[PDB]
């Protein structure tokens, strides 16, 4: 209906730069600094490996059939050749996991031989880790006194080598493997070697890692289905062992030729061969179990630090499973939870059965009709299922380590990257989880992939990573990763939201990082960016990128000048979006740093001038940035600016104006910046300069993913309003109930000056002459809040208005000097934040708010009416009034956007249509005394007719300006000294106040509806400023206040 004029859908000042309770982020405050946890720089290497092998062949030790070792029958070759070959095999078996490390073998040794072995390994691999592999199968079991058994020369005795002396020979960075019976006994000895303390875990201290085959009481298996070398052959030859175990147990065994496992085609590297793909799946399966089972710190040490420890501890989870089946329970020193029977070995068992059945026919002919296992595809689907349902901080997604494994092969690279990005998007926690798995270096190497299929996803992944951790700068620049995103800025690949991310990724790459600046400078990032300057987030981030590039880097600054950067940036200072403008100010701001002119003085004068044009900006966000650029400039020109400040107390006098202007700004955070800039000049070493915040605030956009009750309370109020509009109109309004429903003591010593009834709640707002703001409830007879609108000494209240009545009202408070302050949560007991503050008019300021258009009209004792668009926070228009005397009163129409009424000091009246090339519509006298118009308003209706024109002379004059100049109707409110007027929004009713104590309500046709007399509380006889008369918007409730100290409320029974 037409009553959609009465209900404006325009919301204003409810954007992220106007943020509320927890976040003082909006601006002023610096960005939230982080402290990372995933950081262990030391990529450790196992440099030396000592294989000690204690087996007399056909001489069992007296603690006693199966006897295979390193996949050799030691009886088949005779003792000395057998023991050589097993030494050679076991070496190459280990060597496949760590090919760049030295391997030294020791067969049936003396204690003296082991001493030199260990001393030599430690001397070879100084800080690097040393591996000790012991095999005590042909010697007695380790003691409870902490002993290993070796030989003497002649092989007549078993000689006890104590663990103490081993651990003296090898030191700190070392790792042990004990493939013997009763192997725990060694680990218990190790635990007691050193003094307890030196840690905050179960029982640790050094960097001594220990893998052992079985428990204290336990003995290694004896059945022929296992070898003797079970633990070793799990740890060192996992696939061969896993399958051979699988045949002999699960499928029952006699169907499948077991020796096909030895003849599996391909090599362990090729993921496209059947062997290497089975080895891939194993790593993927094993690594996944470890990640879901262990905590961040322990997993990273064992599974991410050393290529060989990662292999050994991966392959240890197979031992955890197999040994178990043969009455053995192995233990590592960093102990790790139970790993067998995890829902994931199930997936291995499946993949191995599908492999082993296939193997029979691939041997019949090398057909290479090897179907890649579904495993990977199957698991990425279970990651998608997780990403929909339960996708919270509701325990990790489990498939995550497998998503990493897929990034390593083109086979399913795009969907993996897509799903990873989908996962990173849900928050910082998910970025923290991904980086913990170890996604960083793989995603970093993918910045050499030319495939355009990827890049759009890769920019997004990197956006999310760099939104969390800024420090990846160093790694990105070192690999030339910066070029990947510069390409993306200059690409033909569409979508400018992707390009903003590119510009953000580069801005972070550059941020306080001269290696990155210089790299991007050579890569022509000034040219790339400035090419695009001819969407708002993209513009915002081009400036932030450019600004960060030249910041404190004079080569780039020179390049920016001689690429006319000022000429391209400056036009963004007019843009409607505050975010853009503020970013534009930043960019020009960071370009900075008698009678002489060289190149730069032409630029830096032209820059600072263009910044000073935006000192008066409506957004504090902008003003903050302008003050920082002024601070920077002020640093460089202290010589000149002090001399300019001497005479004030070419361009420098303009700066001093702006500094003192900033110091008296309504937003106190801006004010304090102005006070800072002043103090840099010496009015009352770089570290004193304030720092820009526009970059830090904007970055939060990316660390944030890329509802219904919003409409609920909207329609609540609209239904209430539409109904009460019709009732206001259609009910035949009776006389005033002179018995007031409240007579509230403000405790304003001088009295109440302006007041405001709330539409959708039972609330009053009142204002002192010093701009204290109270929020009185009339239905509870209580105070909801108390304020001080600003601490400045020169006070003065002009106006109170609600902004966004239909959805969480903000309280506008206009001051007589033209300052405007808008407060959220003004009804709360003392949690009431200043949302925005700016100086309209650039006195006796008068103001009015038009929700329909988003326009704030402001003027006073000035030639002009000033127009503010609060969606933009800009000074949209300066309309000359064409009066040559002051605007005393000012009413914007609720219905018709743009259209404005204005009363004047000489009693005159003017319409404006502020959206017209010539704004003044008509100019009329009506009432003819030559006294100021104390109040006016458009009539309650849907036309441009006008109650208007209460003159201070006392006559209220009605006029319909479509048809005639002279008056509809005159009503004589008061013989002189009319001090206020109130015109209802919808109901056909008005009211007027006198300095002679008196208040008179009238009908719109002119009838008297009720006299009231505000009596004085003592005999000052000064009820002479009956200033606040105001109606409830949707009800017939009056509210009256005066030069005494009471706010009385009335109604019509």
């Amino acid at each position: 209906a037409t009553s959609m004029a009465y209900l404006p859908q325009t919301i204003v000042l409810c954007e992220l730069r106007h943020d509320a309770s927890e976040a003082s982020a909006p601006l002023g405050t610096s960005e939230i600094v982080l402290v990372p946890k995933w950081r262990l720089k030391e990529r450790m290497k196992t440099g030396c490996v000592a294989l000690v092998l204690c087996l007399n062949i056909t001489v069992d030790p007296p603690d006693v059939c199966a006897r295979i070792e390193a996949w050799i029958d030691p009886f088949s070759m005779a003792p000395p050749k057998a023991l050589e070959t097993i030494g050679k095999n076991l070496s190459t078996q280990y060597e496949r996991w760590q090919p760049r490390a030295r391997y030294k073998v020791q067969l049936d040794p003396t204690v003296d031989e082991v001493r030199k072995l260990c001393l030599t390994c430690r001397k070879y691999a100084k800080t690097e880790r040393v591996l000790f592999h012991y095999n005590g199968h042909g010697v007695p079991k380790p003691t409870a006194n902490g002993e290993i058994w070796v030989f003497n020369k002649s092989y007549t005795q078993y000689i006890p080598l104590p663990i103490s002396e081993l651990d003296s020979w090898l030191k700190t960075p070392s790792i042990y493997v004990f493939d013997c019976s009763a192997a725990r006994m060694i680990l218990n000895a190790f635990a007691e070697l050193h003094d307890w303390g030196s840690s905050g875990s179960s029982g640790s201290s050094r960097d001594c890692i220990l893998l052992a085959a079985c428990d204290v009481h336990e003995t290694l298996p004896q059945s022929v289905e296992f070898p003797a070398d079970v633990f070793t052959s799990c740890l060192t030859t996992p696939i061969k062992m896993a399958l051979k175990w699988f045949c002999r147990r699960s499928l029952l065994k006699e169907i499948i030729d077991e020796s096909l496992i030895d003849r599996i085609p391909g090599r362990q590297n090729d993921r496209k061969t059947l062997l290497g793909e089975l080895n891939w799946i194993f790593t993927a399966v094993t690594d996944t179990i470890a990640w879901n089972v262990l905590p961040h710190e322990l997993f990273q040490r064992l599974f991410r630090q050393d290529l060989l420890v990662a292999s050994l501890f991966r392959n240890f989870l197979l031992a955890e499973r197999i040994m178990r089946s043969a009455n053995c329970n192995p233990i590592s020193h960093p102990m790790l939870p139970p790993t067998h029977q995890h829902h994931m070995w199930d997936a291995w068992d499946m993949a191995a059965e599908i492999c082993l059945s296939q193997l029979p026919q691939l041997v019949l002919d090398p057909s290479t009709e090897f179907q890649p296992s579904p495993f990977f595809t199957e698991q990425l689907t279970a990651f998608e299922v997780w990403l929909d349902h339960g996708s919270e901080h509701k325990k990790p997604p489990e498939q995550l380590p497998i998503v990493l494994q897929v990034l390593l092969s083109q086979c399913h690279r795009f969907r993996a990257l897509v799903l990873l990005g989908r996962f990173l998007d849900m928050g910082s926690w998910a970025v923290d989880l991904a980086l913990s798995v170890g996604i960083f270096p793989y995603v970093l190497k993918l910045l050499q992939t030319t495939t355009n299929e990827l890049r759009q996803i890769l920019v997004f992944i990197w956006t999310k990573i760099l939104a969390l951790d800024k420090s990846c700068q160093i790694d990105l620049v070192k690999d030339g990763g910066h070029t990947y995103f510069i390409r993306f800025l200059d690409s033909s690949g569409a979508f400018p939201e992707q390009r903003a991310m590119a510009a953000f990724v580069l801005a972070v790459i550059v941020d306080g990082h001269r290696r990155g600046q210089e790299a991007c400078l050579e890569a022509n990032l000034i040219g790339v960016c400035l090419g695009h300057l001819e969407e708002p987030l993209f513009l915002q981030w081009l400036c932030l990128c450019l600004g960060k590039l030249w910041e404190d880097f004079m080569e780039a600054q020179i390049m920016g000048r001689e690429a006319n950067a000022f000429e391209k940036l400056a036009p963004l200072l007019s843009e409607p979006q505050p975010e853009v403008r503020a970013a534009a100010v930043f960019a020009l701001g960071t370009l900075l740093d008698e009678f002489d002119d060289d190149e730069k003085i032409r630029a830096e004068d032209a820059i600072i001038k263009s910044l000073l044009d935006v000192v008066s900006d409506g957004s504090p966000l902008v003003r903050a940035e302008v003050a920082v650029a002024l601070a920077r400039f002020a640093f460089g020109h202290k010589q000149h600016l002090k001399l300019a400040a001497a005479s004030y107390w070419a361009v420098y006098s303009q700066c001093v104006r702006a500094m003192f202007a900033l110091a008296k700004d309504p937003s106190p955070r801006i004010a304090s910046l102005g006070r800072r800039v002043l103090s840099i000049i010496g009015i009352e070493e770089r570290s004193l300069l304030p720092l820009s915040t526009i970059y830090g605030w904007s970055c939060g956009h990316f660390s944030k993913p890329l509802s219904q009750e919003i409409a609920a309370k909207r329609e609540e109020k609209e239904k209430f309003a539409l109904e009460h509009i019709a009732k206001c109109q259609h009910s035949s309004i009776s006389k005033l109930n002179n018995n007031p429903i409240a007579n509230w003591d403000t405790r304003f010593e001088t009295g109440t000056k302006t007041a405001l009834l709330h539409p959708f709640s039972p609330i009053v707002v009142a204002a002192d002459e010093n701009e204290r703001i109270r929020v009185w409830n009339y239905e509870e007879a209580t105070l909801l809040n108390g304020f001080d609108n600003h601490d400045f000494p020169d006070k003065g209240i002009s106006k109170l208005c609600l902004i966004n009545e239909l959805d969480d009202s903000l309280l506008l408070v206009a001051s007589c000097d033209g300052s405007v302050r808008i407060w959220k949560n003004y009804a709360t007991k003392g949690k009431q934040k200043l949302v925005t503050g700016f100086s309209s008019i650039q006195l006796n300021a008068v103001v009015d708010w038009q929700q329909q258009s988003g326009y704030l009209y402001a003027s006073g004792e000035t030639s002009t009416v000033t127009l503010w668009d609060l969606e933009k926070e800009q000074l949209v228009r300066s309309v000359p009034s064409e009066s040559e005397c002051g605007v005393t009163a000012l009413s914007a129409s609720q219905v018709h956007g743009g259209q404005l009424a204005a009363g004047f000091a000489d009693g005159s009246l003017r319409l404006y249509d502020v959206r017209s090339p010539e704004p003044l519509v008509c100019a009329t006298r009506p009432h003819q005394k030559v006294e100021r118009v104390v109040g006016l308003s458009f009539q309650p209706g849907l036309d441009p007719a006008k109650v208007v024109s209460a003159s201070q002379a006392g006559d209220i004059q009605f006029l319909d300006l479509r048809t005639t100049r002279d008056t509809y109707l005159t009503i004589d409110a008061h013989r002189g000294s009319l001090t206020a007027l109130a015109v209802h929004r919808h109901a056909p009713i008005i009211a007027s106040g006198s300095a002679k104590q008196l208040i008179k309500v009238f009908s719109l046709q002119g009838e008297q509806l009720g006299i009231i007399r505000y009596y004085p509380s003592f005999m000052a006889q000064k009820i002479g400023s009956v200033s606040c008369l105001t109606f409830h918007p949707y009800q017939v409730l009056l509210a009256a206040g005066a030069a005494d100290s009471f706010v009385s409320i009335y109604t019509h029974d």
């Binding site: 990529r43 590297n269 993921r271 790593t283 599974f303 991410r304 290529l307 990662a310 990493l404 494994q405 990034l407 390593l408 092969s409 083109q410 170890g438 960083f440 270096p441 793989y442 970093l444 190497k445 050499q448 992939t449």
Partner: peptide, 8 residues
């Protein structure tokens, strides 16, 4: 930097 190989 990583434990596992990558194909490109």
């Amino acid at each position: 930097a990583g434990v596992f190989d990558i194909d490109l």
